[PDB]
Structure formats: C-alpha cells, structure tokens
C-alpha cells in the first residue's frame, strides 16, 4: 500500500479530535478544553494548532504522562473530598480566564494561606477501589520572595507526595521567568499512580497545587497520534497520521506510526 485517502475515518474506531487542545491541557482542565471532561477514545488526535491558554506550566516527564492517559483512553475524573483545613482553596488567576472571570485548571486546587497561617498539610487517601488511580498535582514557583510570602506565609515551602511504594519530594524554585499572560511565575506538574490497597499521602508545607480527585486507568488498548489530517465520515480499520488506509495489501510505506489492524512495514 502506498496511497492514503487523506482523511481519518471516524469508524469503526472511536476518534476524539483534540482541535485547539493537547491531551495534557484536557487532562489538567484548561478552560478552552472543558468540553473534553470525562471523554473516551480509541485514538485521540492531537493537532499542530493546539496551544495552551491557561497558567504557564511544565511537566518534567511529559512524554510518559501523555502515554499513560493516552492508553487509558478515558479522561474520566472522580472528585474526592480532601480535608484542606486551614487553607484557602480555589485559587484563581487572571492568566486562566473561564467565562469572563479569573479561574484556574478545573482539576487542580491552588491552596493559599488562611489568616496569614498555612500549616503543614497532611492528607491520606486510601484508594479502596479495584483499579489504578492517577492523581495529578503541581508545585507553584513564585516569582519573588515577596510573592512566596504573600501567597503562603512560608519562605521555604516543601511538598512530599508519598505512597507505600513511591515517594516524590519537590522544592519550589523562586525566580523571575518570561511573562506568560502577564505571569512571571510557573508551575511544575507531577503525577502519582496509587494502586488498589495502597494509600496516597501528601505532606505539603507550602506552594502545593492540590489535586481534586483521580482519573481511572483503563486497559491500554487506546493510544494517541499526532496528525493534522481531517476527521472524515468513512470506515477504515487502519489509521496513519497521513490518513486512514486500507488493510488489504500485506505491506505499506506511508508511515511507520499506525493504529489498529495495519499492513506490516
């Protein structure tokens, strides 16, 4: 096989079009991506035109987190009621506008001090389910020591997200960084998988971007594909970033990246 139709057939596979959204923006809750909440897909197609329009952030191991959610095939999110006693929740920012108001990532709770007191937070979450939980949390990096003190009443914030198997400790990096939507600060995003029977543990003294719940980790038969090809009304079992392709011939030279039953390369 050597030619492609140029379009991605919406059948028989479940095709979810990202449009102006990446997977991580839909994962975190960028207000332009709220329409992607809880969505299921067999193949999720990221676009080149996808862009971030919320609070500026990085993900240290971006490639692997993008692989976990892509395989689960779902963005299903179940809220949990953490006991954030003594802190101000629902932190908002003018860089992440939702419905003409200052907002933030839908799936993230940015905690600030309460009455200029912000105590050592300790929360346990048991994961009594029969399936892997994916917790998404972050670390805020204030621009100045003045910004650190004003937000958290703590010059040296520390964060530790632990389980019975793993532990992650992150320290903020105070400093100036190029203004993104008028924000010289940033946020580092991390994730933790809590397997059934294991407890999620959080030990934040400052700067925490608290999670709001978990994502379900399903059987990884789904995947992700970078492609600019349009989504079309047709039926084809093989899918390549150049478009859908028939699977009658035994070999193909269109693209090495494929999804579904495809000819060998």
């Amino acid at each position, epitope marked *: 096989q050597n030619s492609s139709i140029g379009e991605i057939c919406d059948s028989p596979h479940q095709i979810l079009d990202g449009e102006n959204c*990446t997977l*991580i*923006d839909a994962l975190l809750g960028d207000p332009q991506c709220d329409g992607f909440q809880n969505k299921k897909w067999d193949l999720f197609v990221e676009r*080149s*035109k*996808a*862009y*971030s329009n*919320c609070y*500026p*952030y*990085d*993900v*240290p191991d*971006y*490639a692997s987190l*993008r692989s976990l959610v892509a395989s689960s095939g779902t963005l299903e999110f179940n809220n949990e009621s953490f006991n954030w006693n003594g802190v101000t929740q629902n932190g908002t920012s003018s860089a992440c506008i939702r419905r003409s108001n200052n907002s933030f990532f839908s799936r993230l709770n940015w905690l600030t001090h309460l009455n200029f007191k912000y105590p050592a937070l300790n929360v346990t979450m048991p994961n009594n389910e029969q399936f892997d939980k994916l917790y998404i949390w972050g670390v805020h990096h204030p621009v100045t020591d003045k910004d650190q003190i004003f937000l958290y009443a703590q010059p040296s914030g520390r964060i530790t997200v632990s389980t019975k198997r793993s532990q992650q400790a992150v320290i903020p990096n105070i*400093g*100036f*960084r*190029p*203004r*993104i*939507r*008028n*924000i010289p600060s*940033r946020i580092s995003i991390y994730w933790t998988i809590v397997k059934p029977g294991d407890i999620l543990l959080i030990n934040s003294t400052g700067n925490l971007i608290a999670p709001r719940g978990y994502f379900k980790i399903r059987s990884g038969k789904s995947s992700i594909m*970078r492609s600019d090809a349009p989504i079309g009304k047709c039926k084809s079992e093989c899918i390549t970033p150049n478009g859908s392709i028939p699977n009658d011939k035994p070999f193909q030279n269109v693209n090495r990246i494929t999804y579904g039953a495809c000819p060998r390369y």
Partner: antibody
Amino acid sequence: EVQLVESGGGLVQPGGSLRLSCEASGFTFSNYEMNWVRQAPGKGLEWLSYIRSSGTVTSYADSVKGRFTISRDNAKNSLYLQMNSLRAEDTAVYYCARDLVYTGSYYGMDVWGQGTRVTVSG
Amino acid sequence: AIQLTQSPSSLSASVGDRVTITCRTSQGISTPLAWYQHKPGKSPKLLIHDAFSLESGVPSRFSGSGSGTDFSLTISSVQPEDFATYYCQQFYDYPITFGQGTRLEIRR
C-alpha cells in the same frame, strides 16, 4: 527608527578583560529587559546573560557565569557586559537584544544589536 | 536546563513550496517557542511577529505551532530570499536555550 548600537569589541589576549556597550535609542530603555547573545564561528546562537529593566535582577549562562558581568545604566540608555578571564572559546560575535512584551505575554527578542566581534588569541 | 533538538539540520526546498521545521524539548512546556531568521552578515530577526505586526496588520507568512514537546515552524510559501539558518528558542525558563539551527537552502 529603533536602534541598538554596539561597541567595545576587538582583539584581546587570553585571560585579559574587555567591556561591551549596547547604546539604545528610539525606544524607552527603562522598560525593556536586555540580553547578551553570541554565536561562535561555526556555531549557533548562545544566550549569555540578561538584566531586568529595574536592574539588580540578573542571571547568567553556565558557560560564562563567574567571569562575565551584565549591568545597566538607564540614564545613558546603554547596556554593559564586563568580560573577564577570557578564553579561546569566548571568541564570537556578541549581540544585544531587548525582550518584546506586548500586552502581558513575552514574544521573543525583536530588536537586535548590529554585532560586535571579540577575538581571544595570542 | 531546558534543551532543544532541531530537525533537520540542512533543508533544501524548491521555490513556492511549504516547509516545516521541528524542535523538540527535553521537558514538556505549555509556552510556545520563538523562532528566528539568521541571514548571512545580518543580525537575526524575530520571525513570528516581525516588524510591528502586533500593533499594525496581523497578516504574516511565518507560522509557529506546537504545544508540549513537539513544536513547529511553518513557511506558507517558500521564496528565493528565504535563505537563512533558522533557530528556535524556548522562553519558559532561564537559561534561554536555542537549537542547532536549520539552514534552509532555496533551490533553483
């Protein structure tokens, strides 16, 4: 016109010192963060240093931190880079550039210096 | 530090084509990348928003897309004066870092 004129480049012995100047005109020098960038012959662009518009806020590339020093004088609309303990690899064409911050978001370095050559050789 | 890898290093494109250059980050970032045109014997200029395009007219023929890890620079119509060595830079976190550069080679 928006100008960033550069001066101070030349030939210098290894271990010697040299100072560069990026005089600005056309825009308000007091509001832009200034940068020093170089490319060595046969190499690509290399960011070196940066000052904030208010001064006293600097950081350096690891290649030159401890040797070079960036500085600002808003009164004379000029940027200075003090180069000390110069080595052979420091031979490059040094550029100066401001940060474009339209509305509230950074877009890149729009206005660039003309280029000034520093050759470290015996 | 955030490191960039740029692909390809050399590129020969015929006139009037559409050419895309890719840069990849070591760490995923939400901010886009900035691109530069480096003519021989000239200072590099900002590509994505040249001259006073933000203050004045929006139209331009250099497109810079990509979020996360893979970003791209697209030239809508290759012209005989596009010969340069293009560079990409990230502005998420200092130190500011560039790529190895892509030398476009207009073909006649």
